[PDB]
Design a protein around this nucleic acid. Structure first.
Lengths: 57, 14, 133, 388
RNA sequence: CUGUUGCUUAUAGACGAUGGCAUCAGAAAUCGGUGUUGUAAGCUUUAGAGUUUCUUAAUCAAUACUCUCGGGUAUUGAAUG
RNA sequence: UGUCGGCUCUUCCUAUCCAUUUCAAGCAGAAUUGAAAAAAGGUAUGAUUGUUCACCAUUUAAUAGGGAACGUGAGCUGGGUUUAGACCGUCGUGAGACAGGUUAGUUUUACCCUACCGUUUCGGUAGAUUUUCAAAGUAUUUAGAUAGUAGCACAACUCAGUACGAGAGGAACCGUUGUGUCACGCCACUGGAUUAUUCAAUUAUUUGAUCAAAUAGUGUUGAGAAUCUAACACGUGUUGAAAUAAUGGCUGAAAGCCUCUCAAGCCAGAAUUUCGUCUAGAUGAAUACUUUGUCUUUUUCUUGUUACUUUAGUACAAUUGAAAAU
RNA sequence: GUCAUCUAAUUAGUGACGCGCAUGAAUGGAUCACCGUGAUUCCCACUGUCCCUAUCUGCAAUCUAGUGAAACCACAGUCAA
RNA sequence: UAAUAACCGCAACAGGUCUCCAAGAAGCAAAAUCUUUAGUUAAAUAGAAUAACGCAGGUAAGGGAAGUCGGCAACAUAGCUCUGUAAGUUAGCAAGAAAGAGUAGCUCUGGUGAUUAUCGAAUCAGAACUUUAAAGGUUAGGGG
């Protein structure tokens, strides 16, 4: 599995899944990412995310 | 009937 | 009309807990009263988890369902619970669908995802579920 | 009058009084019942708790609804370096219990064993076993030793070997050994003494004592907590917020007319450093020889059992170890007295075969992500350090 | 032998007690491993809604780019040397 | 002698509600009803009322009845009752009365002895002499008179739409798998607290500005390791023998037959008792070293103990004490 | 009290009925708009009141140097019958 | 002296006792919070450890009064601008009813005058851009 916000590869038996009412399910690596997801923060503007580092360079 | 209260504060004037 | 057993699912729904109704039977929300199979304890409130058959009263809905007591099944909950294969999971809202003692759903459709535990225990729910998460 | 509503009592009366022990090592209260129709073997060992990890294991039971991909379970790692057998003692069954008859020791004894017999070693003359060792080969002493062997063979029923640890192989700062008597269950007293004599001065490794997927009993001293109130000690109900003089106590400590507080009431006192025995604990990995690593048949990367950054508050495990399913009594660095089961478990879950699919080695601090520091370097890549 | 005493000692702890070491002792830095947060201060650094003064070059400017996976913290009850 | 109830908590009784074992029925099955052994374990959540009581709505295997100064106020509460204010109704000429109603009304002290829970310090158990022995001191390894004692309950699969029954309906033993609770633990994974005022941001005030901070008793917000912890995470208590109670039987007289025995002798039979196992634990035992080898009392050194030092006195190897069972 | 209504459930509240133990007209009867640190009931929101307890800080409590009372006290202080 | 030590309360008692003068920030405000002139760092003793039970201040997953005599305690709303505002009524009120939206930083634009081009006031409205999306540090209505 891969984290929905950070894009980090999720280690086994580590993380929490979140299911929305629109049949969309996400899995996160820690509470740090999950709270960022719920605040509608873009991973493209978060410097440490794998999403950001893949876009730039 | 049976009541309950008590208090006093004089304590002389030594 | 319940098939098989269920593993440990931590119960995040209490007595007087309000849930939504995912059915289409004109009932909006149900408040939990008691839980079928609950083993009592002193000062403990009844507890319900996913796939737990509860006794609930409808406080919001059409006149043929409001101010009455029905029997429901918890299909999703906001409480975080752990699967036996190391998967930690939780939903967005607590919801339920009205079933009778024999297990057949009163409604005809379910809106929103349905947890696996409620789908396996009750074959009728899994037949009408959009997705089984 | 009767209590209005009924509820179970808080706390067990089987663990009263709650008196904290004096020695860190916990002595087993018994050994499994002897059978005289098998070869002699040891019925116990002793190890040091390292920490806790989690494993994904493949379910081998049938007619179960567990996931087919594996079940996440906890494990406890107990580093068990080899023991040094430094003697043996025979016990005789009298009308007041087992009575030790004689104790026969080896010629060569390590200072780890000698440290047990003093209380200020650095000021001692360190002359333990001096006369026993210097006069070991004299004709008079050899005759005496031969009598001790024959006396045990004639007037004894229980034979135990006095085995002690080697604390130079563990990261503990303690230097004195941890002596433990391990009973020999097996053939007649004649061949029990023969086996015990053969073990003198030798080393016993845990693989010889325990098997694979074997359920054992663990006795150890729990984690100390100190003076604690009734809420923590027993689990009584907290009083309402309105209460005068405090909330975390027992309101009624007895009726008027037994005229005394009973031993059954919950009182505040010491919680913590108690001795507890837990039975029927399965062995997951017998960390001896090839299996001393952390790789599995499914996950083939080469890695040791120590997580990244070492075990918290313990260090690095580099000797033989046991992988016990679940929890054992006591914190890291505690001394755990293993033992073969007194009542062997016959359940289908006890006879189940253990097939580990993944053993975790990520750091036990924070929210770690990498199994090995080599694969932490690969993912992160070169940083500002080591580039400039 | 044992106790005091030292490590402002711990697997212990209200005080005693208990457990460990006591010159191959101990303590402290630094240092690598391991974690937390989110990319430090500088500049003649390229984006900048606009503005001003020269006469078209300055200057002012929330934020933003490169150096920078940076900087800072990390036993205090973490693991090495 | 602080006077109701409720809250918290422990224990005891059986005239037993459930679970266990049995007998009986107008017990075909299922559901039931009467009775015996048995008190080791459980016996709930709410609307109204200060209520005990009651009546309703659920759930449960069951939601049994009681005692302990009508258990329990230096344990809580102060809703009721039961002072002093005020109101209504009836009564009284009046002050005033009202098991008539309503409203507001200070809940003091443990630092003593014991009990209970934990926790220290000093003291210590009499009869062995094979120097390979005996005893004292210190230390470790053990030992276990006694005291406590823990696991319970439910559900699903199969048995099986089977036994039984005309039909309708409708089980159980073994076996397997889970859940709840209680007890003991534990920190890996998930969650919570967080003055590492950690990292970052930011409102107000002050350092001339940047940097760096400080103040608002922790300014606040986001993430937040460690440690502690979960009713929120997760492990163990599925565990073995013997003897039993009510009862069902065997052989068998009494009483030529019959009889389970108000006879001798046996068997099977419980959530039972005892071993086994878990916890605390007395007198103890073994070994290592230091000693002493006829013995003590009073002084005296030490933090303390043993060995030890001095003046004396005392004993000096040699006939004691065993059948078992009936 | 009886009937409705409020709730899954109402000795509570509200709307009605009235042969009313013992209501009733300046001992004032009926009526309520604003107002009330007045008495009562029900909704929304919020929450450690609660399920069910965890954890953080300061001051104490603990130990030590100096200082240092009082209430109370026949004598005292293990149980069963 | 005129009072957290000179007055009255047994005292160097957190109680009581009439007045005059009165800076900056921010704000509607003599509010809360910080500071300058002046005053003071001592005002019934401290040090170590960081147990229970406390007094004072806090937070908390899922549920949300099921607790209780009773929402007691705590939580929650909270400034300003704009829109919108019911039944009832003594026609004055209810009413800040209820209910919804906006609010920051930076760079600009426009309106409101005096003297006869120069000079000056805080107040209101509007527009691009940026971000961690803005009353909330403090002060600050729960509603029906």
């Amino acid at each position: 599995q891969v984290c929905a916000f950070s894009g980090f590869k999720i280690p086994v038996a580590k993380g929490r899944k979140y299911v929305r009412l629109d049949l969309k399910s996400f899995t996160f690596i820690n509470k740090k990412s999950l709270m960022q997801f719920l605040r509608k923060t873009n991973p493209r503007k978060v410097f440490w995310t794998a999403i950001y580092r893949q876009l730039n360079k | 009937x049976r009541x309950x209260x008590x208090x006093x504060x004089x304590x002389x004037x030594x | 009309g319940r098939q098989g057993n269920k593993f440990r699912v931590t119960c995040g729904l209490n007595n007087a807990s309000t849930v939504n109704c995912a059915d289409n039977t004109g009932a909006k929300t149900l408040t939990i009263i008691s839980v079928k199979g609950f083993h009592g304890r002193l000062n403990r409130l009844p507890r319900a988890g996913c796939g737990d058959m509860v006794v609930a009263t409808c406080k919001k809905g059409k006149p043929e369902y409001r101010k009455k007591m029905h029997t429901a099944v918890i299909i999703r909950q906001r409480r975080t619970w752990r699967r036996k294969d190391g998967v930690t999971l939780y939903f967005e809202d607590n919801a339920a669908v009205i079933v009778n003692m024999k297990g057949e759903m009163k409604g005809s459709a379910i809106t929103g995802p349905v947890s696996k535990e409620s789908a396996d225990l009750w074959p009728k729910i899994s037949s009408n579920a959009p997705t089984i998460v | 009058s009767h209590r209005k509503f009924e509820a179970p009592r808080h706390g067990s009366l089987a663990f009263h009084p709650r008196k904290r022990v004096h020695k860190v090592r916990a002595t087993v209260s018994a050994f499994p019942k002897d059978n005289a129709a098998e070869k002699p073997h040891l019925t116990g060992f002793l190890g040091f708790k390292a920490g806790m990890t989690h494993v994904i294991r493949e379910v081998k039971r049938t007619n179960t609804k567990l996931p087919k991909d594996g079940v996440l379970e906890p494990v406890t790692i107990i580093e068990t370096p080899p023991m040094v057998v430094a003697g043996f003692v025979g016990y005789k069954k009298t009308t007041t219990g087992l009575k030790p008859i004689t104790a026969v020791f080896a010629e060569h004894i390590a200072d780890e064993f000698k440290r047990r017999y003093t209380k200020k070693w650095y000021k001692n003359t360190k002359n333990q076993f001096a006369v026993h060792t210097e006069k070991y080969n004299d004709v008079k002493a050899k005759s005496k030793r031969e009598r001790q062997i024959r006396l045990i063979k004639n007037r004894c029923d229980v034979v135990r070997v006095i085995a002690h640890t080697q604390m130079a192989l563990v990261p503990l700062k303690q230097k004195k050994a941890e002596v433990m008597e391990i009973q020999i269950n097996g053939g007649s007293i004649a061949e029990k003494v023969d086996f015990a004599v053969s073990l003198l001065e030798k080393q016993i490794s845990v693989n010889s004592v325990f098997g694979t997927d074997e359920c054992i009993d663990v006795c150890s001293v729990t984690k100390g907590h100190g003076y604690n109130g009734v809420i923590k000690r027993f689990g009584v109900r907290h009083l309402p917020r309105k209460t005068h003089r405090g909330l975390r106590k027992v309101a009624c400590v007895g009726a008027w007319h037994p005229a005394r507080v009973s031993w059954t009431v919950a009182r505040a006192g010491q919680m913590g450093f108690f001795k507890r025995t837990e039975v029927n604990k399965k062995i997951y990995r017998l960390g001896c020889g090839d299996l001393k690593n952390a790789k599995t048949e499914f996950d083939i990367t080469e890695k040791g059992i120590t997580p990244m950054g070492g075990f918290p508050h313990y260090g690095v495990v580099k000797n033989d170890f046991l992988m016990i399913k679940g929890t054992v009594a006591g914190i890291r660095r505690r001394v755990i007295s293993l033992r073969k089961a007194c009542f062997p478990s016959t359940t289908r879950t006890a006879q189940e075969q253990i097939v580990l699919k993944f053993i975790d080695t990520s750091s036990k601090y924070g929210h770690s992500r990498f199994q090995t520091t080599t694969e932490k370097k690969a993912r992160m890549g070169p940083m500002k350090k080591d580039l400039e």
